[PDB]
Structures are given as C-alpha cells and as structure tokens.
Symmetry: C6
C-alpha cells in the first residue's frame, strides 16, 4: 500500500441548510424543540461556526435557537416557515460573505 502522513485541520463549510415545516410532534420531541413550529437545520465546520451562525440567524428573522452545538457544529432554529426560511437563507450568504465559507443550497421538506 501507501503511507501518507496527514496533518488535519478543519475546513470552512456549510454542508447543509434545511427547512422542515410540519415536523410533527414525535420528531419534534425527539429533536428537543417546540411543536407546531417550522425547523431549520445546519451542519457547520468547524464546530465553533455554530455560534457565529447563531448570531446571524437571530438577527435575520424572528427565529429562536432550539439548540446550538459548538462541538458537532449543529444549529437548530424554529419559528414560522417564513422566518425560518429567511433566517436560513441569510445565514448561509452571511457566512460566505463575512468568512468566505464553502456554501450549499438551501433545501426544504413540506407536508
């Protein structure tokens, strides 16, 4: 085979930014967020980006932090479908702009 030594470092990337309107009570309960709200999901690298994204999203629309995970880089917000959608949209563009992140497409699940 081949042996390579590899100095690892975090990349800067928004891997997914997903909207889920009408998650349902079971999923909501599992996730640890309020029922009857839309939901925004982001994975971020490095993990500390979640605090930055948290700031952005809060300032972008009327959304709330379900939870913020500075280790995994997870961030979950909730609120109206419209608020969550804007918050997501704004936060992705803000990261590529302020920090020149690798970005992704915003995605959605409905029904």
């Amino acid at each position: 085979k081949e042996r390579i030594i590899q100095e690892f470092v975090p990349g800067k990337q928004v891997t997914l930014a997903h909207l889920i309107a009408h998650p349902g009570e079971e999923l909501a309960k599992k996730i640890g967020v309020p029922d009857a709200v839309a939901i925004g999901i982001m994975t971020l690298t490095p993990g500390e980006t979640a605090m930055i994204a948290g700031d952005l999203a809060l300032k972008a629309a009327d959304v709330h932090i379900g939870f913020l995970d500075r280790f995994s880089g997870a961030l979950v917000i909730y609120g109206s479908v419209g608020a969550v959608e804007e918050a997501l949209s704004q936060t992705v563009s803000g990261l590529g702009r302020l920090l020149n992140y690798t970005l992704c497409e915003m995605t959605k699940s409905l029904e």
Copy 2:
C-alpha cells in the same frame, strides 16, 4: 514518507439502509426498541442528516423512531415489515432527490 495537510469536511452519504424483520427479543432489548416489530437501520453523514431522514421516514409510512442520533448519524425505526421497508425506500430516494446525497442499496435480513 509524505506529509499532506488535510482540511476535513463531512460528505453527504447514506452508507447503509437495512431492514431486519424478526430481530428477536435479545437483540431488540440491546438495541432499545420494542419487541415483535421489524427494524430499519440507517447510517448517515453528516450526523445532522438523521433529523431530516427522521422527518422523511415518519411521513413515508406508519413507522416510529426507536431512536435518532444526530451525532453519529444513526436512525432506527420500527413497525411492520412493510411499513419499515417503505419508510426506508422512501427516505433514501428523498435524500438523493432533495439533497443530492450519495445513496446505497436497501438491504434486508429475514427469519
């Protein structure tokens, strides 16, 4: 040898989607799911995909979340063999469709 610096980032992939009808009480107990039900197993990357897959599966058939792990990316559902099988099938195609994931084949264990 050779030294490479490596900025790591999560891939987007469904690595496995497996059905297990008749798991048995011992395995069920270990896994932390009800007995007398079929079982669906998925590994997902990044870990946060488990919440998205959770949504999809719940909406695809009459299945329930045994547990959802947004860290490892694990998701276990249960229900009838038919319900679990459809939920699995739907969830994989839904991820490749909505999010353009790398997908896998659905698999099964019976007896």
Copy 3:
C-alpha cells in the same frame, strides 16, 4: 506542503473477527462478559453495522451478546467455542453477501 480538502465517509468493512477460548476470569471481568465461556470479537465500520452483525450472529449459532456498540462498531458474543466460532464465521460471510462488505480472515486464541 500540500493542502487537500477531504469529504469523509464511512467505509464498509469487517476489520477483525477473533475467537478467544479460555479468556480467563480477569480478562472476562475487564471485558464485562461471563466467565467460563469462549468469546467472539468484531470491529465493524460503520458503527451501525454492529446491530446487523448482532442479528446475524444470534441466528447463526447458540451465542449471546456480551455487548453491542453501535458507536465504535464493536460486538462481543460468548458461548461455546463451537457456537462462537460458527457465529463468527457465518456473520462475516453474511455481511459480504448481503452488504458486499470488505471482509477479513477469522482468527483464534487458545489455551
């Protein structure tokens, strides 16, 4: 040096499948399994494979789950040397068959 971006994803592999007859009480105590039994050890990737392997092994011979680790991908079974050996043999082939895993040789420690 060189900078590479690396999207990571789990491989599908059975890295080891080892039989240990006569482990002794000290090792058994450390491992958290009954004394006076043979022992089967498997490392699996991804971690969720341990539930699938758990199913296979239980169905292959008269063995029992010492523990199943869906995070590390560890699975430890115990029983007679013959039962453990068959369970191991069957589970490896089953994974390569059902899921086309990268497989390994079965190994053993005696005395």
Copy 4:
C-alpha cells in the same frame, strides 16, 4: 478503489478569529457568556493551543475568558468591542510569531 494508510497528526492552525459585537441576550445565554459584551471566537488546532491563546489574549487587552476548551480547541473571550478586537488581533499574530502557525483573517459581525 485505492487503499492508503494514514498516520494522522494535528496541524498547527488558527482557522477562524471572529468578533461579534451586540450578540444579544438569547445567543449570549446559549453560549454561556455575559450579556452586554462583545465576543471573540477562535478555533485552534491542536486543541491544547487554547491555553496558549488564552494567555496571549488576556495579556493583549482587557478581556475575559468566557470559556476555554482544550479538547475542541475553542476559546471564547468577551469585553468591549475594542478590547476584544485587539485581543483577537494580537493573539493571531502572536501564534504565527511564537509558534509559526497557519493564520487566518480576523472577521467581525456588527448590529
């Protein structure tokens, strides 16, 4: 495919150094820092660099450690916008100077 063996080792890098004036009480509460203060965010590799950066930042301006994470390599400081900004600026240059780290640009979020 291809098989490579990879001996992993930590790189030496400041991946981000971000200033957030006016984070808001919600974000502040989530993050575990005082309200009404600016905030500095750094990700560092290896994780132990957070203690070194902690030293630098404290000595650079009138800032305080919200928290220091020698595992993830996270470090959060707070104080006036001016103090936090200087602390950040100084700490980045200090690491590249003393330890020849790979550095980044300082960034900021306002409003």
Copy 5:
C-alpha cells in the same frame, strides 16, 4: 485546492509498546496503577485490539491489567520488569503472527 472523498477504515497496527520500570508514585497515581511495579504501554488500532492484546499479555507472563481501553485502543499492564517485558514482547509478535498486524519496536525507560 483539491477535493477527495475518503472512505475511512481502521488500520491494523501496534504503534508503540513501551516498558517503564520505576515510574514513581506520582506518575503511577496519575495513571491509575499500583506503585512499586514496572509498567507496559501499548497503543493499538483498531480500538478493539486491546481485548485481544489483553488476552495475549496475560498468557505470556505474570502481569496484570492496570486498565484496558477498547475505545482508544490503550492497554496498560504492570508487574515485574521481567514479566512486563516478556508480556510486551510476546503480545507484539502474537499480533503480527495471528493477525498480521503492522508492528513496532519494543522500547524502555529506566531509572
């Protein structure tokens, strides 16, 4: 830059096998082993190899398990300098033999 997708899997390797005679009470306390004994240190990949090595070492000489870590792949034994040395020597060769591991040199610290 360059983007590579990387399916990760554990290698099979004994990275170090080190003997420490006369560790001293402070170090011993930190490590969580008895004082007045020599000490053997191994790092193993995958993590589950520690249980196999544990078996080998116990059978090779009159040594005892300080602790066995099936997650990190750590294994610490203790006993006489001679017993620990033989246990180490035997365990390394046993792994390369039974499992065709990548091996290392045995090392020692004295005084």
Copy 6:
C-alpha cells in the same frame, strides 16, 4: 471527484512543547493548575504518549503533573520556570531518542 479508502493509524509526534511563565490566576484557574507557577504544555500523538512523557518530565526536573490526558495526548506540568523549561527540553529529546518521534521546537511566553 475521487474516492480513496483510508486506513487510519496514529502518527508519532510531539506537535508542541510550550513554556508559560506568569500565566496569571484567571488562566491558571481555567486550566486547573496552581497559581504562582510556570506551566509546560505538550500535545502528543498517540494519546498514550502522555504517560511516557509524564514519566520523562518528572525524572528530568522538579516539576509536577497538573494533569495528564491519555486520550487527547495532553500533558500539563508546573513548577519553577527553570524546572519546567528543563523538563520540557528533556522530554522532547527523550521521545525522539527512545521512540524516534517527530519532534518540534520548544517555545515560551513571558511577562
């Protein structure tokens, strides 16, 4: 893109060895070491190297273990600036000598 399978294994490396005289009470408190002492910081791979380095440093000068982390590979010592400096110096050379590690430069923060 490109798919590579990657068997991972720990490298053997001292990534940093840093001296901090006059850390201050705040930083000291955060770090979990006594005030009014100099401080030595090392990151080591693999994680188990921290026990070996712990032995070396203790034997090299009149220093004490603030803490030893066999998981992350962290080791923090304290004592006089001179004792800590020698302990660090000795431990790095000892590792390259006994174990042929990849080494680093010793570094320091003063004032």
